[PDB]
């Protein structure tokens, strides 16, 4: 009976135009699904796709019951830490980790002073946590997210550095046996068994302590999923594999579905949108990401605010200056102003006074948050096709979803939104969100749990000689 | 951990461990103490402790329905809540917030009731546009330090958070609400006054049958509980028939000023110095040593005396430092989530804020002291947890807990539970199994003082009493 309820004509004519041009229906989602599906496909198949689909050759699912000890490293672009995982063979684990800040010569230093860095900080945690030693090498596994190929779990050659890092001597080159020589030269009792992306740990760990998750979601500055398929349905893998790699063999595959519609058919870009992607650094790139991350959410409220400026709607008497910086508007913007409690958005208004030096009304306020709520709630129904592909894809007619990124956890209902969209999706009959059949859960730690236990499913079949690559390597 | 800190600076690492580690001995003597103000409080005479009856002498069932009210006044904002009881341990809700004008604090009394009647109006006429008819029962959380001889009175004893408004110290200020909400024709009876903690106590209770204390740990520091009326001497000869000696009574305990006599706190001369430098010297003790308002400030002080004594910070530019209250709580806060080995977090702190550059070995100093006084005050908390269970022989527990310092300082929740396994000794595995442990409480002055308001409801309309007698 309130809402939008003080706002001019003039005002609440050009909503009405933001809400036709951020609204997505059910049956858009339904049809975006369908194009995903068939992308999903087209990226398994011989020929490829936009999607890259890639597996990530963990070929068996967590039981739960698996024991030990094991080891995961995470690099990142700032930070690594190490992880040190007990599993204790009841869908249950301990862990304990420790973190360090790269040296900022690292970025742009020799390949032997970053895993010779790596390998001291390894030294230092496993001295720490075993200091009489183990009976056997610590299996670990290496969360290196980074564009990298892989033909077996146990290797990663580098596609191309990222977040300004810049070291001769790698790119092409596979890190895995780089990283374990200066373990070694240390004399630490390590294997590294595996390298992986956090997406594949997200699903794997979430797995083995929740056996109805089909799915790892990443939604936050990335975007990423990961889900198990079978051998038989990757035509691309067909005369490639060994024999304990049979057809009935579960295959997790890493979407970086970041790509879907580069092609730009199926995805309701906006004018808004359309900036954003020409004016980022690789246009015609990246297009269900530059829809769905929380990294641009700011930027499309920013591009709108600037449009509706300069067409003479609101600010008119503010000095608008520093909303002309691009991304000056981070994700916090449509946080903050979604999270407003008050009546009056004193929040909103304390965020624009104090940080753009811009002063609002209380309508301008309200058009503010009803454009934050179109942008956050067009997000979430975007991501929620993907998931929704997924479950299409394969079959899956319940499911958890188990999700992690820092819009999940902290961008206000987002869970709200998103179990909406899929219950808009499906049109089921149901009351509260934690019965909906299809649903986003609480992640595990990907980039470290996830990778220790990967590291075991993967220690355990090379104990066993069982291959966990394309015959031959 | 701390193999690379030199030798006589470890010395002083020590020192500080001594002062401020509270063993499970001294917790228990403590308790032993905080029992006796516990009784001296109810007792005709008064003890330091006020131990305010809080007029809710039933416990809810989970069965109650219907829509009620609650208005929640804060120092800076005002919450306006709407409650749906459907008769099953379970609600929902729907609030609005007001944020109250910058002249509010020092203005007139009418201001203040008439500025919270508009907001009341404006939230009635959103969710009952076409009226009601009958009016909506309110309860209304007012957490000043109040006096109570019936529900839905609250005689002002002294204004906080730098509200300083004439002519309402020593009168109920109820009325003063009531009558600006007649004059607006808002269809509300304003039926029970209640502080926060005893609505985390009530709504916790609704929605979790084994709760028996609701708590409050942050900036302010609070506990209730439910007594029994045969336990409360000061209202022997005071009550009617109908609210007899078996009958629950909730206690809005008001313990902050638990040993202003200063007679069993483990003060350092780090919290006489906060003390004797504070607004009210030798008053609001307990919630000196239990508070999260003075967790940093306690941690400056040490720091400076390390600074003076030549031990740190030596080429350092300290003039920040030397400020009072310039590290809050999310100073010892961000210092013990800070998660590098080389403590990363805590160095970009200290330079960004305080413009002083440490060494590695001075933040772990800087993260020994962080925990220690985190610890403490977590330890010396529980002590009034363990104070009401034993008074009342509850043997097991849940402990419906609130406030910044509960819900976001770091470990906090595993500081507690330690703490009352090392007073009780327990012969306990997990954390999750402990006899009395705390849990999260429901909202306390929004769904607790609706709850109030239906229980309170409930008694008037059978003509049942909700107050002394008179």
């Given amino acids: 009976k309130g809402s939008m309820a003080d706002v001019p004509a003039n005002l609440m004519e050009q909503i009405h135009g933001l809400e036709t041009l951020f609204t997505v229906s059910s049956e858009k989602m339904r049809s975006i699904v369908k194009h995903f599906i068939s992308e999903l496909d087209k990226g398994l198949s011989k020929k490829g796709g936009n999607i890259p689909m890639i597996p990530g050759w963990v070929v068996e699912y967590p039981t739960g019951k698996e024991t030990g000890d094991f080891l995961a490293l995470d690099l990142g672009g700032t930070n690594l830490r190490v992880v040190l995982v007990k599993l204790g063979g009841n869908h249950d684990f301990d862990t304990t980790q420790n973190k360090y800040r790269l040296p900022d010569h690292l970025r742009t230093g020799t390949s032997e002073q970053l895993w010779s860095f790596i390998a001291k900080c390894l030294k230092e945690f496993v001295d720490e946590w075993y200091p009489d030693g183990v009976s056997e090498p610590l299996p670990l596994g290496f969360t290196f997210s980074y564009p990298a190929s892989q033909k077996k779990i146990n290797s990663g050659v580098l596609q191309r550095w990222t977040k300004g890092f810049d070291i001769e001597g790698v790119e092409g080159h596979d890190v895995v046996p780089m990283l374990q020589e200066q373990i070694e030269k240390l004399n630490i009792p390590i294997n590294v068994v595996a390298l992986i992306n956090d997406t594949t740990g997200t699903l794997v760990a979430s797995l083995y302590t929740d056996p109805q998750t089909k799915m790892g979601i990443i939604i936050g500055t990335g975007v990423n999923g990961a889900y198990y398929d079978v051998v038989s349905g990757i035509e691309k893998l067909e005369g490639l594999l060994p024999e304990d790699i049979g057809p009935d063999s579960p295959m997790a595959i890493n979407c970086e579905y970041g790509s879907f519609d580069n092609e730009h ?26 829809m769905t991350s929380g990294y641009y959410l700011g930027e499309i409220m920013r591009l709108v605010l600037l449009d509706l400026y300069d067409s003479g709607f609101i600010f008119k008497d503010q000095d608008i200056s520093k909303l002309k910086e691009a991304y000056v508007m981070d994700t916090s913007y449509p946080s903050k102003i979604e999270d407003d409690p008050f009546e009056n958005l004193e929040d909103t208004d304390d965020l624009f006074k104090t940080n753009l030096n811009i002063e609002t009304t209380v309508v301008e306020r309200k058009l503010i948050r009803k454009l934050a709520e179109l942008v956050g709630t067009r997000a979430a129904r ?15 007619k319940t499911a958890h979803i188990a999700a992690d990124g820092s819009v999940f956890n902290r961008y206000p209902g987002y869970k709200e939104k998103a179990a909406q969209a899929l219950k808009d999706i499906y049109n089921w009959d149901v009351e509260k969100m934690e019965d909906h059949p299809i649903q986003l859960v609480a992640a595990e730690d990907g980039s470290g749990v996830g990778a220790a236990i990967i590291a075991c499913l993967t220690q355990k079949r090379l104990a066993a000689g069982k291959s966990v690559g394309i015959k031959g390597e």
């Fill in 265 to 290: 058919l199926v995805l309701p870009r906006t004018k808004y949108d359309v900036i954003i992607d020409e004016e980022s650094p690789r246009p015609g790139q990246q297009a269900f990401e530059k």
């Fill in 382 to 396: 975007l991501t929620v096709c993907g998931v929704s592909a997924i479950c299409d894809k394969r079959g899956y």
